[PDB]
Design a protein around this ligand. Structure first.
Ligand SMILES: Nc1ncnc2c1ncn2[C@@H]1O[C@H](COP(=O)(O)OP(=O)(O)OP(=O)(O)O)[C@@H](O)[C@H]1O
Length: 123
C-alpha cells in the first residue's frame, strides 16, 4: 500500500458532502480498517474531490508540526469530519464522536507525482 493510497483510505471521502448522522465515524472508522489492530484515537476525513485535496500540494507552504517544510495549507475552507474516540469505547467496540466542520486543511506532500501522504492539521 503506497503512502498516497494509505492517505486516501484514512482521510478521503468523496462519497458524501458531509456526515449527516452523529454515527458517521462509527461506520467509517470500521469500514476503512482504522479500528483493526486497536482503536485509532482521532481521525479526520475530508469531503472533497481527490483532485481538490491533491491540488493542496501547491497551495500555501507552511511549517509542518514535525519541523519539515513539505506542508501546505489550503486557501479555501473544506468540508471535514473529525472522529474522536469516546472514553466509554473499548476495543473491539470502538465508538466515536462525529464532528462536522469547515476548516482549512494542512497536509504534507511527497513523491513524483507530488501527492498528499500525511494530514498535519486543520485551522
Ligand atoms: N512533514 C511530515 N510530517 C509527518 N509525516 C510525513 C511528513 N512528510 C511525509 N510524511 C510521511 O507520511 C506518512 C504517513 O504519516 P502518518 O501515518 O502520521 O499519516 P496520518 O494520515 O497523519 O496518520 P494519522 O491519521 O494517524 O495522524 C509517513 O510515512 C511519513 O513519512
Amino acid at each position: 500500500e503506497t503512502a498516497a493510497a494509505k492517505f486516501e483510505r484514512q482521510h478521503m471521502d468523496s462519497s458524501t458532502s458531509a456526515a449527516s448522522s452523529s454515527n458517521y465515524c462509527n461506520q467509517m472508522m470500521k469500514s476503512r480498517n482504522l479500528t483493526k489492530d486497536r482503536c485509532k484515537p482521532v481521525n479526520t476525513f475530508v469531503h472533497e474531490s481527490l483532485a481538490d485535496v491533491q491540488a493542496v500540494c501547491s497551495q500555501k507552504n507552511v511549517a509542518c508540526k514535525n519541523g519539515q517544510t513539505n506542508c501546505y495549507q489550503s486557501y479555501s475552507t473544506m468540508s471535514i469530519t473529525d472522529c474522536r474516540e469516546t472514553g466509554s469505547s473499548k476495543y473491539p467496540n470502538c465508538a466515536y464522536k462525529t464532528t462536522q466542520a469547515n476548516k482549512h486543511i494542512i497536509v504534507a506532500c511527497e513523491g513524483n507525482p507530488y501527492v498528499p501522504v500525511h494530514f498535519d492539521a486543520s485551522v
